[PDB]
C-alpha cells in the first residue's frame, strides 16, 4: 500500500522528416580523383568543394 513515483509522461514520435538544402549538382569526382596530373607532395594542391 502507498503512492509510488513512476516514469515521467512520454510521447512517442509518429513520423520522421528530413530537411536538406536545394542541391542538384553532383560533386566533381572526375576532376579530383581522375585528374591527368597530380601535384608533388612539397607543393600539394588544395581544391574547394
Amino acid at each position: 500500500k502507498g503512492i509510488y513515483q513512476t516514469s515521467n509522461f512520454r510521447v512517442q514520435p509518429t513520423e520522421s522528416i528530413v530537411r536538406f538544402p536545394n542541391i542538384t549538382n553532383l560533386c566533381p569526382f572526375g576532376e579530383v580523383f581522375n585528374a591527368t596530373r597530380f601535384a608533388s607532395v612539397y607543393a600539394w594542391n588544395r581544391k574547394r568543394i
Partner: protein, 49 residues
C-alpha cells in the same frame, strides 16, 4: 565593570515586557529525479545502454 562590594545588592524597581522574534526552518523542498530523462532524454540507444 560591576561595583562588587561586601555588603551591597542591586534589586530592580521596574521591569520591561520584551517581545523578540526567532526563525527556524522546519522543512525543505521535496524533489524527484528521472534518471532516463536526465541522462539520455529520448535516445532509445542511451536508454538501452
Amino acid at each position: 565593570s560591576v561595583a562588587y562590594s561586601n555588603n551591597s545588592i542591586a534589586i530592580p524597581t521596574n521591569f520591561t515586557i520584551s517581545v523578540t522574534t526567532e526563525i527556524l526552518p522546519v522543512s525543505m523542498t521535496k524533489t524527484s529525479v528521472d534518471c532516463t530523462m536526465y541522462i539520455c532524454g529520448d535516445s532509445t540507444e542511451c536508454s538501452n545502454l
